[PDB]
């Protein structure tokens, strides 16, 4: 009887990811995603389940981890609302329901040093940069696959990007209460977090309401060996699961 | 309940002190795993650490000031405080708001206590025997415009009559549309480039309009109505990080510019105690 | 000077023998712990008891080797100024290897059944410090300092009672929309 | 004994003795036992 | 219960009247051992001599004075008595302090009664219908600085609202860290050549901050708040010698210089009656 | 014990913790040492009332050696042993020493104490006391 | 069923040591330390057992392993006679009995080369540097936590420090007959040797008589990679076990 | 009958009939009987 806990394989639909230095996958709150049971439904229309079409690993544009990078933030299902048929099932309805299997990728040699904080913050309502009673404009909190780069300059309507305050007024050291995993270049290179549907209602809008938000916050600065490139690619791959939609509708109209 | 188990010298290949936090798990390492411990008992249940007690104690959550006087010639009454209305929000006082924000979802039937005190800084020979009418306003109920409006009948609007100084005590079942209050709502009420973020149906519970129904005496009685609230049937989900920066608004996690440091800087280097 | 992400990064220096890494008191309701989740929850109470769980995670290169000794000094004695004085009390020798995280449980060593959450002399919890056991050895082609991530968590035997108002939040103007 | 009919009047439930900190402390897919190597 | 047994003339070698106090024992010598006694019964139980009744009757243990007025322009409020705070101590009144000091360790849940009376020596046409807010302050709770501080919300701090003249009645379980109160603490809080002796964690229970929440009338209402205390669930250990010299401080057995004699000198020689 | 200055003065740790020296109630008071009025038991209680405590009289005509087994008395299961002294031994001559004609007006009093059921927890860097 | 033989944890009292590259611990002569049974006792006074107070890991001052270091030698219980309450229990009695759990620490990367010889020599009576019939003076053989550095200059009364002759006239290659372990930087970084009480009597003096002597003799010279510091710290940690003392006495008076 | 749940509300216990003045009057190691010589 000989096996390994770092060699993991996750097959969803027609996509397959392989890893040999992965950490024990985190199941948020020890609750796997499950379809909405009838005992809690409030809407009357029947739900459609694009089980195989949308529940697959969608690789997002990789990010560049430099010595001065503050972190990155992604909103779901916003991060996948421009991805194939999932985006259409998300727009053409008034609401949607689906889980997420996040998979962050950051590989390096045994000489590099650094630690990334991969945390899922359900209902991550960010703070505006103007204070007082200013709001954050829908055009920014819903970037899409672009995500929010916490090192860039603030624009009118985008929340503040002070990674220290988690963009919402909470300290970085306290985010560990949420389901998270550290990508320690010496021990781990790929993080996995199975995110279920978290909301106060059985079903809610999927275009105007983002249930969870993925954040990759470098805790320890990247210290590359002498003569190596001071950059490492971070590839985020998210796979929906247990997807449901109700009320096929005229396309949801977003700005642009 | 056993607190610490008896453990002597340990020389084995199982190292409960070594782990990998990269997995995101907090191993329940006990004192018996690092040292030699003796048999001890808890003698403690934790009744005061429950969410029902941590969040379920009566406290002040809003306040206002009004007057009861000869209202003749005051075209704008409500804005002159002939009666004042307050939108129910558990996010205006900070010492309870933080405890409520420690979680993402909270479901509770409420308990309210409306504290009014009579007073007369100006020349006034006595403090009247007032009878304050406290009124609940559900979404749609006619937001009254004058102290003598057609609303105070309270046929569908709940009303509670009581004298100043003494308080009303009415319970409210959980009035949210969801299964709990959206302590954090990373979502908009609808898709518009000009809508408000966070503050939505889940936030608006109505409002409480304060007044007095007694006809006026000969002087201005500036009444300050302080509202107290206890949470009942409290249930919490999705624990969150403690609040670090203060607030400026209700329901919004927005903070000010150049906020003050929260971490207590050391006196000396990291090696000081 | 200001709050930064480096505040959670314990700097380590290579080729350092018998030197201190960091030092801190165990007043969980003040100091470095005042802002942590455990400290924030404790500040809502006046009395606390039980054992604390302190963990350090190494984030340096994988080809690096280093041995650290986490030492807990119960109350009554000053903070350890050397490694020989620290190692006399409760200590755990940490060998940094495949296991990147160490978990040293601070044992409950007190006469009174409960300590005060606010910094008090009579109910002092003691001191916590870390020292270089042998040295920090970095592999070739690597320079600079490596950092440790320190974690704090409560044991299942932790106790809290006598709720009180916290001093970490303030307000001077009733809130409007 | 209650003096009112509707549930808005009943008193608090007291304390929920059913505790389960595993969902927050060990929300991991694979089981991790204390002492055994976290990763292997 | 038999009080005295029947005993006639006694001519034996057993001398119950002769003993040796050098052993430290008090032989329970009865009247039947020295004289001829008759059969008598007790007809007495001793319910009023129990520690639960001797120490468990409500009594005044602290008092203060405050005012409720137009507080405009008073930078230092608390020190101007816009609200006053008192550190809980059972050692400020002597007639109860002595009874409490008769033992070394006492464990009790408490009962408090806060007595406030309205009054106006200066020109004042009436005595307002006040609503006093009484607040418990645990160690760490923000010691309020102004009558309108961010503390009075009382979300975790216990608060009790009531009108002047009428009193609050809240029970407090035993809040000591030990199994009892250290009525005598022959020990220091820590080892320092400048620390205070006796007064330590065991002594500090918090403090009670008194105020009024009603906005001001037209005159100063100098309120004197007298606090009453009853002891409940009283348990005593290690009985001590009765207090002979008076006190000057709280928790300290220190007395003044040239104290007055306590023994009543005789009128004449030792042979006088 | 009570301080000699009254008001709100404290007694300094350097005196109440003499060591094997003990406190001689006939000597002069020093700044930080409690008052030595044996009548008031150094705490404000009369000498005649100390008999409520476990005691024994050494009557030269009947007894020459006293024995008192003292257990651990404290409100906690464990407390500090350096800053906190649980019990205090006192030898107070009640009747004055009347030696026969021509004898030395002095008698030696030797105090011997034996710990029992000893326990310690948390071997630590030496406790640092003044001096 | 998956475990490792290099990951070991030894918990004694309030001290805990962790290691991940340790070699199979050596139990000298396959005899674990045990309390003196009544069938062999010759003294009449009852023994006191400071089980938890003295049986803990005491870390000794680390040594610097250079390219020219000859080795180090420590005497027990002399090495711990100035350590807390153990030293007082050792002095204030005429005799003592206790085992020892030696733990040597020397960590390095996979690029360093070298081999240390950790050997326990019971009754290591050293040789004097003057020859003829000269004696070795008590002031040197009993250093304390200082130990004996075999690379230093000889002083009047200290034994000879020719590491080749083991300071007693025996060749270095023959010390392997004693319970020993090699700290091979490529395979092992921490050695462990459980030493029981070895003596011809049931009880003997612990101040004038040292039962065992710990030696760390570098066999293969330290070859650090190009550009690295030519030094590695060697930390020796010893933990008494099964301690006994008899006849609490006026303090044992040693010189100085 | 109590009107509250927590023990801080219950009433006093009344009187503790279990008396034992021997611990204060005769805290002696050896037993001393009335009438017999205290010392022999």
Swiss-Prot record, chains D, H:
Location(s) in or outside the cell: Virion
Changes after translation: Myristoylation is required during RNA encapsidation and formation of the mature virus particle.
Role of this protein: Lies on the inner surface of the capsid shell. After binding to the host receptor, the capsid undergoes conformational changes. Capsid protein VP4 is released, Capsid protein VP1 N-terminus is externalized, and together, they shape a pore in the host membrane through which the viral genome is translocated into the host cell cytoplasm.
Subunit structure: Interacts with capsid protein VP1 and capsid protein VP3.
Annotated protein name in UniProt: Capsid protein VP4
Species of the source: Human rhinovirus 14 (HRV-14)
Coverage span on the entire protein: 30 to 69 of 2179
UniProtKB/Swiss-Prot annotation, chain F:
Compartments where found: Virion; Host cytoplasm
The organism's place on the tree of life at top rank: Viruses
Subunit relationships: Interacts with capsid protein VP1 and capsid protein VP3 in the mature capsid.
Its biological purpose: Forms an icosahedral capsid of pseudo T=3 symmetry with capsid proteins VP2 and VP3. The capsid is 300 Angstroms in diameter, composed of 60 copies of each capsid protein and enclosing the viral positive strand RNA genome.
Record-given protein name: Capsid protein VP2
Upper classification of the organism: Viruses, Riboviria, Orthornavirae, Pisuviricota, Pisoniviricetes
């Amino acid at each position: 009887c000989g096996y390994s806990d770092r060699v993991q394989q996750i097959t969803l639909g027609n996509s397959t990811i392989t890893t040999q230095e992965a950490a024990n996958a985190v199941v948020c709150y020890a609750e796997w995603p499950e379809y909405l049971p009838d005992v809690d439904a409030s809407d009357v229309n029947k739900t459609s389940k694009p089980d195989t079409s949308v529940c697959r690993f969608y690789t997002l544009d990789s990010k560049t981890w430099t010595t001065g990078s503050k972190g990155w933030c992604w909103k779901l299902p916003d991060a996948l609302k421009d991805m194939g048929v999932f985006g259409q099932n998300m727009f053409f309805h008034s609401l949607g329901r689906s889980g997420y299997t996040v998979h962050v990728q950051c590989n390096a040699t045994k000489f590099h040093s650094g630690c990334l904080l991969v945390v899922v913050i359900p209902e991550h309502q960010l703070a505006s940069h103007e204070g007082g009673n200013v709001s954050v404009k829908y055009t920014f909190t819903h970037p899409g696959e672009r995500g929010i780069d916490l090192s860039s300059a603030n624009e009118v309507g985008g929340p503040v990007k002070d990674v220290i305050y988690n963009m919402n007024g909470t300290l970085l050291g306290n985010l560990l209460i949420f389901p998270h995993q550290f990508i320690n270049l010496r021990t781990n290179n790929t993080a996995t977090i199975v995110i279920p549907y978290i909301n106060s209602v059985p079903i809610d809008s999927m275009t105007r309401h983002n249930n969870v938000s993925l954040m990759v916050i470098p805790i320890a600065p990247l210290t590359v060996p002498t003569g190596a490139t001071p950059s490492l690619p971070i590839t985020v791959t998210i796979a929906p699961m247990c997807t449901e939609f109700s009320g096929i509708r005229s396309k949801s109209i977003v700005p642009q | 309940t056993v607190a610490s188990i008896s453990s002597g010298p340990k020389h084995t290949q199982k190292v409960p002190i070594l782990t990998a936090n990269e997995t995101g798990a907090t191993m329940p390492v006990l004192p018996s795993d690092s040292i030699e411990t003796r048999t001890t008992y808890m003698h403690f249940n934790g009744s005061e650490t429950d969410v029902e007690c941590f969040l379920g104690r009566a406290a002040c959550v809003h306040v206002t000031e009004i007057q009861n006087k000869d209202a003749t010639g005051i075209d704008n009454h409500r804005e002159a405080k002939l009666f004042n209305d307050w939108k129910i929000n558990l996010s205006s006082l900070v010492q309870l708001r933080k405890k409520l924000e420690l979680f993402t979802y909270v479901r509770f039937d409420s308990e309210y206590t409306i504290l009014a005190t009579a007073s007369q800084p100006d020349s006034a020979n006595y403090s009247s025997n007032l009878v304050v009418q406290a009124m609940y306003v559900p979404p749609g109920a006619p937001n009254p415009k004058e102290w003598d409006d057609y609303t105070w009948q309270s046929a569908s609007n709940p009303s509670v009559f009581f004298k100043v100084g003494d308080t009303s005590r009415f319970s409210v079942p959980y009035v949210g549309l969801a299964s709990a209050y959206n302590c954090f709502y990373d979502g908009y009420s609808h898709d518009d480039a000009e809508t408000q973020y966070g503050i939505t149906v889940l936030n608006h519970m109505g409002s409480m309009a304060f007044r007095i129904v007694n006809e006026h005496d000969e002087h201005k009685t500036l009444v300050k109505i302080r509202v107290y609230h206890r949470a009942k049937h409290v249930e919490a989900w999705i624990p969150r990080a403690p609040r670090a920066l203060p607030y400026t608004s209700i329901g919004r996690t927005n903070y000010p510019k150049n906020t003050e440091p929260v971490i207590k800087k050391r006196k000396g280097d990291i090696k000081s105690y | 000077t200001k709050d930064e992400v480096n505040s959670y990064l314990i700097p380590l220096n290579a080729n350092r023998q018998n030197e201190q890494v960091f030092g801190t008191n165990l007043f969980i309701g003040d100091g470095v712990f005042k802002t942590t989740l455990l400290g924030e929850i404790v500040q809502y109470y006046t009395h606390w008891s039980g054992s604390l769980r302190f963990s350090l995670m190494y984030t340096g290169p994988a080809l690096s080797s280093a041995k650290l000794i986490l030492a807990y000094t119960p109350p009554g004695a000053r903070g350890p100024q050397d490694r020989r004085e620290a190692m006399l009390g409760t200590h755990v020798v940490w060998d940094i290897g495949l296991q990147s995280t160490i978990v040293m449980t601070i044992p409950w060593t007190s006469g009174v059944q409960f300590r005060y959450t606010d910094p008090d002399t009579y109910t002092s919890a003691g001191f916590l410090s870390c020292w270089y056991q042998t040295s920090l050895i970095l592999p070739p082609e690597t320079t600079g300092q490596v950092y440790l991530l320190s974690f704090i968590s409560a044991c299942p035997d932790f106790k809290l009672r006598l709720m009180k108002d916290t001093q970490t939040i303030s307000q001077t103007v009733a809130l409007t929309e | 004994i209650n003096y009112y009919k509707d549930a808005a009047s009943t008193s608090s439930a007291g304390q929920s003795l059913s505790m389960d900190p595993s969902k927050f402390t060990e929300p991991v897919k694979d089981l991790m036992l204390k002492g055994a190597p976290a990763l292997n």
